Each structure stands twice: as structure tokens, then as C-alpha cells.
């Protein structure tokens, strides 16, 4: 493969195909399917990280959409990135405005 040759889990082949076929440019370098597959791999790790955490915190062995949402909205940097994305079955973070609380 090449996932091997770059220590990646993410299909370095698949990616090289998709760049060429998805009409981004005439020609496509050798490093880029690797650079990108990596960045894709990197980021899917950070999510899987904090969601899993969240599934532990929420006492489950399996990650459901909520755990993703919690991971995402609680992370300041990830939340920005997915600033315009609604995640199916995410729900919302619990947040109740002060002045609404009892006295």
C-alpha cells in the first residue's frame, strides 16, 4: 500500500483517486494524497478521542451521535470548524440563562 509507507490508517490510494476525479486541478502531486489523508486521519482522531471520553463520561461503551455533538460543541476549536453543521441526533448542550433561574 502507501498507508503503510506513511504510517497512516487512512486509505492513501482512495484519496489520490478522489482528488484526480473530483476536478480540483489538471495534475495531482504524490505528496498531497498523503498529506491530506493524514490531516483527515489526524482530525478524525481528535473527534473520536473527545467523543469516546464523552461516552465514558456518559457511561457507555458505544459512541452515539450525541457523544459526537458533546465532544464538538464543548471543544472551542472543533466547534468553530463545524460552526455551520447540524449533527443529526445531536441535541444541544445544557445551558439555562441566569435571569431565568429561580431566586
Amino acid at each position: 500500500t502507501r498507508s503503510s509507507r506513511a504510517g497512516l490508517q487512512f486509505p492513501v490510494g482512495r484519496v489520490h483517486r478522489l482528488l484526480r476525479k473530483g476536478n480540483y486541478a489538471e495534475r495531482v502531486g504524490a505528496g498531497a494524497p498523503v498529506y491530506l489523508a493524514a490531516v483527515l486521519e489526524y482530525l478524525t482522531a481528535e473527534i473520536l478521542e473527545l467523543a469516546g471520553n464523552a461516552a465514558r463520561d456518559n457511561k457507555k461503551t458505544r459512541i452515539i451521535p450525541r457523544h459526537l455533538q458533546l465532544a464538538v460543541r464543548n471543544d472551542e476549536e472543533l466547534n468553530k470548524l463545524l460552526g455551520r453543521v447540524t449533527i443529526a441526533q445531536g441535541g444541544v448542550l445544557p445551558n439555562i440563562q441566569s435571569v431565568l433561574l429561580p431566586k
Binding site: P11, G22, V39, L48, G52, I64, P65, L81
Partner: protein
């Protein structure tokens, strides 16, 4: 019975790399796959304009790189460039 692709199995392998004793639902699996494709477009897209902007025909790891720096928030970008520059050099090692 059509052979529809995804990133499912690799998402999993990476899941094991980070949370070995943890699993995932199909519903969340879709979200991970959606996430991957969305991010792939956004980076690929930026890269594409980058090339054009600079009257050049090739999307190299460099184009991808700077694409990443426009697409990602300070810290997440930072690590991304790492893993990016790393796996590339490690790739150009082997042959």
C-alpha cells in the same frame, strides 16, 4: 447489489488507536463519514483555488498544506501541519 464505498473501516481502526476498548453506532458512523467527506471537500476546494490563483496546474502537498492553514483554527491547524509534514516525509522515506 451495488458496492457503495465509505471511510467506515478506517474510522474504526483509528478509533482503536485512541480508545481501544470502545465502540460505535451506525448512526454515529454516518456522522463520521459525513464529517470526513465535508472536510475533504473544504480542503480540496481551497487547494483548488490556491492553484488557480497562482496560475499553476498542480495540487501539491504544499497547496494542501496552506489550504489547511486557511481552513483550520490556530491549534487544530498546528497539529494538522505536523501529522501532514510527518506522514509525507515518512512516505518519501519508504519506496
Amino acid at each position: 447489489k451495488t458496492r457503495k464505498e465509505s471511510y467506515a473501516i478506517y474510522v474504526y481502526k483509528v478509533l482503536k488507536q485512541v480508545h481501544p476498548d470502545t465502540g460505535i453506532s451506525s448512526k454515529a458512523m454516518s456522522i463520521m463519514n459525513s464529517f470526513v467527506n465535508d472536510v475533504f471537500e473544504r480542503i480540496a476546494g481551497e487547494a483548488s483555488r490556491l492553484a488557480h490563483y497562482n496560475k499553476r496546474s498542480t495540487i501539491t502537498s504544499r497547496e494542501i498544506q496552506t489550504a489547511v492553514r486557511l481552513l483550520l483554527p490556530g491549534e487544530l491547524a498546528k497539529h494538522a501541519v505536523s501529522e501532514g509534514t510527518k506522514a509525507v516525509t515518512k512516505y518519501t522515506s519508504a519506496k
